[PDB]
Design an enzyme around this catalytic site. Structure first.
Site, short mmCIF file in Angstrom:
data_model
loop_
_atom_site.label_atom_id
_atom_site.label_comp_id
_atom_site.label_asym_id
_atom_site.label_seq_id
_atom_site.Cartn_x
_atom_site.Cartn_y
_atom_site.Cartn_z
N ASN B 107 0.79 -1.22 0.00
CA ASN B 107 0.00 0.00 0.00
C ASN B 107 0.83 1.27 0.00
OD1 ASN B 107 -1.98 -1.96 0.32
ND2 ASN B 107 -2.89 -1.04 2.17
N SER B 138 -7.27 6.53 -0.03
CA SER B 138 -8.44 6.06 0.73
C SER B 138 -8.89 7.16 1.69
CB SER B 138 -8.11 4.79 1.54
OG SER B 138 -9.17 4.47 2.44
N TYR B 151 -3.72 -0.81 7.95
CA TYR B 151 -4.24 -0.40 6.65
C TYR B 151 -4.45 1.11 6.58
CZ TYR B 151 -7.43 0.06 2.72
OH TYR B 151 -8.04 0.42 1.54
N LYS B 155 -2.60 4.15 4.38
CA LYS B 155 -3.30 5.06 3.49
C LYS B 155 -2.98 6.51 3.86
CE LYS B 155 -5.21 2.23 0.53
NZ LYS B 155 -4.85 2.32 -0.92
#
Ligand code: NAD
Lengths: 250, 254
Positions: B107, B138, B151, B155
């Site tokens: 990511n 995101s 996560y 982002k």
């Protein structure tokens, strides 16, 4: 938070801003001060111990880029000895945008990994006592120094991660807050050498000494506010408010 | 930005959001559309080609987690063939907080690395033509889903990185903007892991609330590409396209 007779683990305690925070912490009559850093500084370590010989200071050679499993092995040895740990201070970090992988591994992944490791000892869901995590992030996590975009992005990530940790405290029993220093009184690498003079330029601008950044650091630890995003800039201590742009509803 | 006659590289073009974005992209008369994705999807590739036979579509099997020299090698192959590339879209991501290292590698690091590699061909300081980078970040980069902290943090990192990239455009000639979907109905959110299983029902609870389709997301994605605003932070939530303003908490003064 009264630091008297507390047990503290400090990752990267003997580096720049770490050392001056460490000097003040040992003056607060801690029971144990446990130092985890990549390399020993025997002169600095001896100096620290001499401030208050009663404080148990132990040193472990520790590389924050090791897997979670390795961090758990070290932590088990520490918990086996101390029984309890009250606070973990994460101060590891590098500034070098020529080292993309390593910047991320140390500043972001390593911080997540050691947090994950200690949660296995603190998680209240598994009978753990809970705990406190103070993450040294950076003001660049709010707004980047765009000439060191990788560094800045890594700090943005740990500001985020810390925020989420705090929101998870009701589940885990582990509270957290970020300590975000401004420019603190040497030259470094910009990404793709967009600006070879970042250090020269930043250090000319109004700054603060490592001394009262360290004093404001200890003040923040004493305030012990879950979810705080502390700005330590120009010798002041200020909590910033994070903007709500979006809500998961969960 | 008129997409007619443009050359586009799209990393992760075949996932939920990717494929619907790709369907919309090839509605415009692109010259070349170059797909880099981890696993080949011959059915989806055939479908896209059929939409607009005027667009030349190629595919490369590519993992964003490879070292930068490897990505550079593939880009050289592409630049030698096409001569020019107008837009790069970085869209790779996983959502699995049981996979800390991999989440960050895909990511964040992988996005930074492809960007770094392509700058070698584009950097105006080298006599390159400049270019445009669209990064799929995101809304979680603004405000976390705290049950997936890793996560969300990854982002936040790429939102930051993209902001900085855009601020560097006057030096590099490479402009950039972020594309930040809200919850979008794709396999990504069907079933997923929370960090230390803090919330084993996270996917259930998230999807109890309104979402948008990948079709809507893809339509708005291309709209944002056509707007072509350097430094934009685009929110693509509940079927709308909206630019957000990043709060100024601190200034480097440089
Ligand atoms: N679905 C949502 O609600 C939502 C919301 C915001 C952002 N996003 C982001 O949008 C992007 C696409 O997500 P999606 O919902 O279509 O999920 P998806 O799982 O359907 O697709 C993910 C895409 O990333 C690619 N990918 C994964 N690992 C890769 C690797 N190692 N190398 C190269 N490519 C790799 C996949 O092949 C696929 O093309 C992701 O970056 C995701 O984080 C999704």
């Amino acid at each position: 938070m009264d630091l008297t007779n507390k047990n503290v683990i400090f990752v990267a305690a003997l580096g720049g801003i770490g050392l001056d925070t460490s000097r003040e912490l040992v003056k607060r009559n801690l029971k144990n001060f446990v130092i985890l850093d990549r390399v020993e500084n025997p002169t600095a370590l001896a100096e620290l111990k001499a401030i208050n010989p009663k404080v148990n200071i132990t040193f472990h050679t520790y590389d924050v880029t090791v897997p979670v499993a390795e961090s758990k092995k070290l932590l088990k040895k520490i918990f086996d000895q101390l029984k309890t740990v009250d606070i973990l201070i994460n101060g590891a970090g590098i500034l070098d945008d020529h080292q993309i992988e390593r910047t991320i591994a140390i500043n972001f992944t390593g911080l997540v990994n050691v947090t994950t490791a200690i949660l296995d000892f603190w998680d209240k869901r598994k009978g753990g006592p809970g705990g406190i995590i103070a993450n040294i992030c950076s003001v660049t996590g709010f707004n980047a120094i765009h000439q060191v975009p990788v560094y800045s992005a890594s700090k943005a990530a740990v500001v985020s991660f810390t925020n989420s940790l705090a929101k998870l405290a009701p589940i885990t029993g582990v509270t957290a807050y970020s300590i975000n220093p401004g420019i603190t009184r040497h030259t470094f690498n910009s990404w793709l050498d967009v600006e070879p003079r970042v250090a020269e330029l930043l250090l000319s601008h109004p700054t603060q000494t490592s001394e009262q950044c360290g004093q404001n650091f200890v003040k923040a630890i004493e305030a012990n506010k879950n979810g705080a995003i502390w700005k330590l800039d120009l010798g002041t201590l200020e909590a910033i408010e994070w903007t709500k742009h979006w809500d998961s509803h969960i």
